[PDB]
Design a protein around this nucleic acid. Structure first.
Lengths: 114, 151, 150
RNA sequence: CCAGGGCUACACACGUGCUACAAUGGCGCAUACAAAGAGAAGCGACCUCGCGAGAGCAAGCGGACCUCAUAAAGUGCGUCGUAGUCCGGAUUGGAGUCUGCAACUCGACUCCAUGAAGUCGGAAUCGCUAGUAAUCGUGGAUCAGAAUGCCACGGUGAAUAC
RNA sequence: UUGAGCCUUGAUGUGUAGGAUAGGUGGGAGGCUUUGAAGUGUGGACGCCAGUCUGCAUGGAGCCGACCUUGAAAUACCACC
RNA sequence: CGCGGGGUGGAGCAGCCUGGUAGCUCGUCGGGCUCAUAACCCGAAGGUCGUCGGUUCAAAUCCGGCCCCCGCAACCA
RNA sequence: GGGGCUGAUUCUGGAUUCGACGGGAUUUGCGAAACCCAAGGUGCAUGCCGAGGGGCGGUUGGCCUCGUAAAAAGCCGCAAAAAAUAGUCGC
């Protein structure tokens, strides 16, 4: 059922069940589920109550959605309000890692509505 | 083309039994060079249909192809002045070939679970002309019989 | 309907590919003269610099004179109300030495001047002979075709 | 002649590419099969360590012996059950790798996190009739490092031409 | 001739049940049959073509009514029509 | 002023009557169709019948109304 | 010269140029102009005199500068400012 962030899956694989929250993907959640002592493909209904509550502390070890959603803004605050080179590209929808801005890098700008 | 009247590609027998019809089904589902993978699905299309229709492997399709097979199709032999499709009686080499292309392409349509399952469901109704095969064939005859004779 | 004079001769001279329904801003004396009042449309093109797409060739003179004090000239570069989607793309495929934006027709959209504008490409005269031949070629082809049935 | 920047700028158009939009598939496990090649101020095993990119250690090789180099699709098993999902991976933050005096502009990347656009492409258009289209890999040139480009090779394998 | 008017007369009308081309209202269980029957060959009528109306003669001498499923009921017989 | 009828899919016309079991096509979209469109072919959609009551086993039907479109002779305050 | 008519499709009230453009406002990222607090850094500097200002001259009524006087930056005319700045047709 519900785990610490929100983490409410529907009867999927337990590794992929943990992927529904921001801040942890499939490969990281397997290391999270490594200490859980449960199978990969067991469903949420097949996840026992004695193991669901132990999943709240495991996902609380690594920093997750409850505090990681502002960690991107802090790194943005190190660039956007600090006037760095990446922040100048970050503010006006430009690539920051050196994409060819002449033709490509469309999805960094956004949709091609114009 | 202009002068090349070379013969067609010789059809090998299928690697379960000698059959030009079933081996043509193996060679029509081949995608990205994978014919061994195409061999497995096209085998499960009729053998499951044999367990669905209570028939054999070589008769669940042979009586099925008769419904799919057309008689006269309208080629678009228009010179440019008039958009006229003068009909041509389809050659017997292309008569089953036009039939076999209609049903396997219909298996690509309605993708629910697997191409083995989709082709089996698209062949039982085609065995009694109540699928997309008779939808394809009779729609040609709508455009064929409405334009009967031209020179 | 509410259509005004249209540049039908532009189709003989240009082979326009894509069209638009951008609106045109116009002065107070223009609106009265637009429904009736002898508006002409020949040699209509554009003079873009940044966002200043102007209907250039549009001779519309005031029929009943409504001009006082300051000047009022019948031929002006009227400002077009263009979408921003339709604006940035004209920094590209209109600057190709032969590419231009022309107005095929003029009309109304519920008492608003919306002008059907299109990106012309322009025919050289060596291919102008082919198109006039082709139009006669299509007609005479079925004349040969009908003689089989006489 | 020098150091830094620029040739990597982008409200925009066009050409050519790779990647898909999946269940003939994706993922996990098991498992079998080639040639083109290239190398010494280079190829670098094996082993050790690092999740790894790689580092430490270091044999053989200027070569039918040594090394790059584990082939993939395929097959089998497990798993997924028609969704923009376990598709696609762009964008993006943090931590590291190698190149070289140096990687901010601006390298390739690896690890973790993010998760998009995109659900089949109008009008129009090309390629080819065979080991072809198609697909999957591999090497090489250039190169300190650095290609979806270029050249070369291998595997599977059509359809139709009235 | 052409229509209308009315006399005489057959034809003439299966929501749904249902064997029924049963109209309504209504008096009614014996009408009727060899002063040639059930039911034939069918003609034509016919029609929501369901199946009746149905000449003649063979057939030759029985059939239907309350009776039955029906909202209702029986042209077994009729009266207003 | 009181005489003649009909009002029904978005549209124009029928079924009603000789009761019960609402359609047609025009305009629409769905497809075919196609160097391209279209000719033309079919697929689909729509009002409980102008409204309100009564009779009737049975109302779109029939009858009472009411309303609307009108047509009409009236028209000497 | 007088009278009548018409004066953006509504011809008696409910304009909504589908648009960059001109304008205001809101949310949002925060900047001595979108700010102040001597506090964190922080001891010998600031202001007026003198003082020259890129290539030329000047230049903010005030400046990158000057420990008592000739060199260094933004900017103004000068100067690297471009052109069939839609088509199409000609000698």
């Amino acid at each position: 059922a519900r785990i610490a962030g929100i983490n409410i899956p529907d009867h999927k694989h337990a590794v992929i069940a943990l992927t529904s929250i921001y801040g942890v993907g499939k490969t990281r959640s397997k290391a999270i589920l490594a200490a859980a002592g449960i199978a990969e493909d067991v469903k949420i209904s097949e996840l026992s109550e004695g193991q669901i509550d132990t999943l709240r502390d495991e996902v609380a070890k690594f920093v997750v959605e409850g505090d990681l959603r502002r960690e991107i803004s802090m790194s943005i605050k190190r660039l956007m309000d600090l006037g760095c080179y990446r922040g100048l590209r970050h503010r006006r929808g430009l690539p920051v890692r050196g994409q060819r801005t002449k033709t490509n890098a469309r999805t960094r700008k956004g949709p091609r509505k114009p | 083309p202009r002068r090349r009247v070379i013969g067609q590609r010789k059809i090998l027998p299928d690697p379960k039994f000698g059959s030009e019809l079933l081996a043509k089904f193996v060679n029509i589902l081949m995608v990205d060079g994978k014919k061994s993978t195409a061999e497995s699905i096209v085998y499960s299309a009729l053998e499951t249909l044999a367990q669905r229709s209570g028939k054999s492997e070589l008769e669940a399709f042979e009586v099925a192809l008769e419904n799919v097979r057309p008689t006269v199709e309208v080629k678009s032999r228009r010179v440019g002045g008039s958009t006229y499709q003068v009909p041509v009686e389809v050659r017997p080499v292309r008569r089953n070939a036009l039939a076999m292309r209609w049903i396997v392409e219909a298996a690509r349509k309605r993708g629910d679970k697997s191409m083995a399952l989709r082709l089996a469901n698209e062949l039982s109704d085609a065995a009694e002309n109540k699928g997309t095969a008779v939808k394809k064939r009779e729609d040609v005859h709508r455009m064929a019989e409405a334009n009967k004779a031209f020179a | 309907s509410a259509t005004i004079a249209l540049n039908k001769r532009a189709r003989h001279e240009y082979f326009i590919e894509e069209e638009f329904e951008a609106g045109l801003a116009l002065q107070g004396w223009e609106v009265k003269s637009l429904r009736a009042g002898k508006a002409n449309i020949s040699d209509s093109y554009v003079l873009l610099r940044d966002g200043e797409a102007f209907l250039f060739g549009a001779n519309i003179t005031p029929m009943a004179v409504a001009s006082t004090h300051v000047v009022c000239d019948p031929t002006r570069t009227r400002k077009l109300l263009l979408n921003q989607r339709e604006l940035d793309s004209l920094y590209g495929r209109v600057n190709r030495e032969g590419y231009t934006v022309v107005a095929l027709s003029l009309y109304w959209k519920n008492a608003w001047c919306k002008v059907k504008i299109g990106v012309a490409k322009g025919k050289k005269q060596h291919d102008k002979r082919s198109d006039i031949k082709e139009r006669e070629w299509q007609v005479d082809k079925a004349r040969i075709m009908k003689n089989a049935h006489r």
